[model samples]
Each structure stands twice: as structure tokens, then as C-alpha cells.
Target: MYGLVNKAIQDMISKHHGEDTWEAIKQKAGLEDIDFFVGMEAYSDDVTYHLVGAASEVLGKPAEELLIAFGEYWVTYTSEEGYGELLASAGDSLPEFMENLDNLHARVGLSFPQLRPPAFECQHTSSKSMELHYQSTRAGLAPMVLGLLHGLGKRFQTKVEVTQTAFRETGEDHDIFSIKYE
Candidate 1:
């Protein structure tokens, strides 16, 4: 991930938790220095992992829950950071946007060489639902995927229900989401 992600986490935490809490999280994550990260710069996944893990500990929330919240926050934060039009261009509705998710990630990757963006393939099964195939080398973020889709649902003012049909942890090579949207 890019430093912008960490910055967005900090921004999200700060917006709700205040600067002092953000400072504590940064300190706990060993990123006390403001110069440690730039929005466009790339950083180790370890840094993000450390930050989220430490924040989870400090905030007394489960890691998975924290990630889900972070994913939701990311939606609002990115929109506020001036990506509203870009995100809007990705799709007009939940299903449309879900179909273009891979294209969106690829486009984002073109701007950041270090970004290991995940892959998404939307398979429409019926008028009310689709199967979203999510592939990534990263681990422990399937919960975030749930939150992200839910966030997108809120953004599009649509209803979304997701079920985990496949998981890498259980002999599957990829995570699959059964997404039903309105």
C-alpha cells in the first residue's frame, strides 16, 4: 500500500479520535515523525500492519473489526481527499462500480508502482446479485472487503449483502464474495 493509506488512517482517526490519539497511534507504530510518510510515497506493509495492529490493541477492538472500520473510513476519506470524481467515474451504481473495480485498481496502480492492488472480477449471476471474485497475495483482509463493499453500498445509496463463499485459509486460493445489491 501507499503512504497515503496510512495518512488516510491517521486522518480518519484524527477526525474522530483527535490529534493526540493519532499521535499516540503513530508513536506506537514507530512512526512518530511527520516526515516518515508522504501521501504518494510507498512504505512497507509492515508499517501499515504495525499501525493497525497497534491501534487495535490501544483501542481495545479486534483487529478484524478495526480493519472493517478502516475500510469504511477509507471510503469517506478518499472522497474527501478529492477522489470523488474519480470514484464517481468508476461506476454509477453498486453493480456497475463492482464491475469496474479491477479497472479502477489497475488505473490506480499506474500512478504508484509499489501499489500491490488486489484484483476483482464481477460475475453477474442474476439481476439482484453477483459473485465478486477477489484475489490478492495479502492476508487477513477479507473482513475489510466486507466493509468496503458495505461502504460502497452506502455511498451509492444501495442495499448490499455479502457472503464469503471461499477463503484462502480453508484450502481455497482466493477469496470469493457473493454480493447481492440493489
Candidate 2:
């Protein structure tokens, strides 16, 4: 899954930029080892919100309005089992939704969020088990990956699942987070 997702991202970057530039970015980021891995789960919500917001902007509609519409479309197209009907249950107008959006922004602003790696501890006693770490701070990667997945899923709409896990030695583990998306 990691390799598939990473390759997809690299392909997208190479398509947008150049292959040489993408290679340079990968080399600069030092992502040559199996120990280096990135998880998309941490930024899933943000990516979803931003994509919806961008779609709204392009359509000349408010973000909230677009979000509801998207939620409906997603549920309908995906045949999501549960909570499918709730998307259209919002009894307020677009203005009310926008107000709710403003309130959500304010609340999130005060949350002091932290982006900890989603850890995955080994269940078996095996010293040979490999450890991995993935880091990316560029906000665009999340949305870009999400967009790619959305498109890919639409093209081949199956039960595709992406998993993320973090690991480190028991004794001493350094902060694996990086501020660059190399």
C-alpha cells in the first residue's frame, strides 16, 4: 500500500513538475530506505476539507454548501452503508451552514493541534522486524494524495483501504517528524 501510494504521488509530481525535479525532491528528502514511510491518515480530514473548499471556490459556492453537496454525492456514489441519509438532513440554509463553518474554524483554531505519527507496535517478539518512519510537512501533499485516491477510486471503485503505522526501537526513539516534504 505504501509503495503504491508513494508511486502514485511520485507519478503525479513528475507529471506536474518534471521527472528530474521529482527525483531531486525525493533525493533531497532522503526517502531511499524502508525505514522512511509516510501515513496519509493524519491529514485525511484536512485534505477532504481543502478539496471540498477548492471545489466550492471553483463553482462559485460557499465551502459549507459544497461540503454538504459533496457529502451527498459521496454517499450516493459510494453506496455508503451507514449515515447516508444524514448528509442531506441539515435543516439550515447555506447562510446557516456558513455560520457553522465559521464557528468550526474558530473552535479548531483554539485546539492547539499536534501531528503525532500514528504508531504501530509489534505484537510478536521479533528483533528482525523492520521499523519505518514517514514525514512530510508540506500541506499540499495530503490534498494531492486525496485527490489522486478519489480519482483512482472513481476509476476503479472498489474497497480500497490505505493503512498507516509508525514504529521505533523501544529504548530511545528520536522525533521522526520533518518540516519538509522531500
Candidate 3:
């Protein structure tokens, strides 16, 4: 991961949880004090894991839920961080954006080197439904993908329902999401 990710986590926590709460979570993560990482700096992936785990412990929620929130937060955060133009140009609609999600990640790699972004495939099944296939080397982030889709729905002014049809957890292949939009 990079400081951008950790910084987003920090920003997300502080945005909703207050600075004191963020401080407590940081402390709980075993970092007595840490400097805010520059967006371009690299960071150990474990740092993010530790911080998120600590957040889950302090918030009394599952890591999946936290990651989903974080994933959703990431959209707004990045936009506010001055990447709105890029995101804006990615696509004109939710399904279009989903189809270009991996392309966006590839473009983002120029600036965010440590990002291991997920790849997406979309099959439009009906007028307002699609099958989104998500492929990632990372585990335990399918929920985040769902959240990202939800966030994209917000961006595109659509209502979306995403259901997991195939999952790695049950020994199936990549995660498959059935999506309906309106």
C-alpha cells in the first residue's frame, strides 16, 4: 500500500469518527504516534491492516464492514483530493464506469504505484441489470467492491443492488456480483 491509502483511512476516520477517535484507533493499532504520510509515499501493507483491525475492534464491527465503508469513503476522498476530473472522465454511467474501472486503475497506477486495484468485467443482462465479475489478487475485499458499486451508484444517480452469486470464500472462482440498477 501507499500513504494515499493509509491517509484515506485516516481521513475517513477523522471525517466520521472525530480526531480523538482516530487518535485512539491509532494508539490501539500500536502506533503511539505517527506522522501523516505524504500521498506519494510507500507504506507497509500491514500498517493498513493493523489500523483497520484496530478500528474494527474499537468500533465493535467486522473488518468487512469497515473495509466497505473505507472503500466507499475512498471515492469521495480521492475526488476531493483533486482526482475528480479523472473519475469524471472515466465513464458517463455506472455500467460504463464499471466496465472502465480497471482502466481507471491502470491510469491511476502512474501516480499511485502501490495500488493493487481490482479488475472488473460486466455483462449487461437486462435493461437495468448486469453481472459484474471482480477479479483481484487481494482477499477479503469483496464487500468493498459491493460498496464501491454502491458509491458509483451515488455518483451516477442510480439505485443499485449487488448480490454475490459466486465467491472465493466457498471455494468458487472469482467473486461474481449480480447487479440491478435503476
Candidate 4:
């Protein structure tokens, strides 16, 4: 999977940014493990390219542009705020939250919005996941994404199911409630 994904990525880079840029990106990302594992998957080509394209779209730039911008973003935003320290802690937290349920105590079936995490991390297991992360604390990303999904679902007259786990060593673990659409 890794190899195939890597090859597809390399091909895309070569086609869009040139071989030199591809090599540089690989080196910068330290993609040795990715390269190896991506090749083992049969669906690597489409999945890899799709992910690359989605990343490009999310960043509002081309793949190469995002690559360059990522470096800058890392230096500007990711280098501080206990980024390295939190990862080094090696401790995980579990937190959870839910919405649009009628009976909070009875596990009532309710139509609500579900929240999830970003691709880089798992929403259910991340030490950073939180139940009220949507309250604008700049904590976990799952809440934010959940908010967006909720808005979209409402606009379309639909309901979503969101399940998340939050962890905090000093605090209590959160188990997210289910959202059902009738």
C-alpha cells in the first residue's frame, strides 16, 4: 500500500511539480515508511491521489503549494503551544460528547449531529479529543468539524450520527452519545 501510494504521489508530483520538487517533498516529509507501506495496497493509486487532492483542496492550493505552505505552517503554528511536549507525554485522554437527544438519561433515540476528528488523528483515542471542544476553546478539532457537519445537515434537512471519545488523565473519560435521524 505504501509503495503504491508513494509511487502514485511521486507520479502526481512529477506531473504537477516536476521530479526535483517531488524528491524534495519526499525528503522533507521523511516519507520512507509511507513509501514502503503504500505500495502494498491494491487500492493505493486512487486512494493516495484522492488524499493528495483533498489535502490540496483543503489548503486552497496545489499539492506543491500545500507542501511549501505546510512547512511554513509547521514553523509558525505547530512548533509551539506544547506541540512536541504533548506528543512526548505518551499519555492518552478519552473525552466524549453528544447533541440533539431528547432524554439525556434514558438513551432516547434522537436526531442529532455527529462529530469526528481530522485525518491526522483519531477522534476516539486522541488525548486531545474533548466533548465541548465546539465551545471555542481551541482544544480538539473533532468538535469544530462536528459543528460544520451539523450546519450542513440542517441545511439539507438531514441528521447525522456522531460518536467520539475524549481522554483526559486528570479528568473523566467521555463517551459520546449517538445521533439518529428519523
* lDDT tens digits, residue span 80-127, model 2: 423223323421332222223334334433542443223222221122
- For all candidates in order, the CA lDDT equals 0.85, 0.34, 0.85, 0.37
**Backbone atom clashes (below 3 Å) for every candidate:** 0, 3, 0, 20
TM-score, structure 1 vs. true: 0.93
TM-scores for candidates 1 onward, in order: 0.93, 0.24, 0.93, 0.24
In the range 1-182, model 4's lDDT, one tens digit per residue, is: 22432454465456656766665555554443444343333443344444455555543566655443333333223224223342223222112113221122122112112211212222232342323322222232333344443533443455555554443322434323233332
Q: How many backbone clashes does candidate 3 have?
A: 0
After superposition, the stretches of candidate 1 with alpha carbons farther than 4 Å from their true spots are 33-36
lDDT of 4 at 67: 42
Name the weakest run of 10 consecutive residues (lDDT summed) in model 3: 30-39
Q: Write the per-residue lDDT of candidate 3 for residues 25-137, one digit (tens) a residue.
A: 99999876676767887777778889989999988999999988887888888788978999998987998888788889899887777677778999999879989898887
Segments of candidate 2 deviating more than 4 angstroms: 32-182
| Candidate 4: Cα lDDT at 150 | 52
The local distance difference test score of model 1 is 0.85
Candidate 3 backbone collisions, by pair: none
**After best superposition, candidate 2 residue 110: deviation in angstroms?**
42
Candidate 2 residue 97 Cα shift, in angstroms, is 25
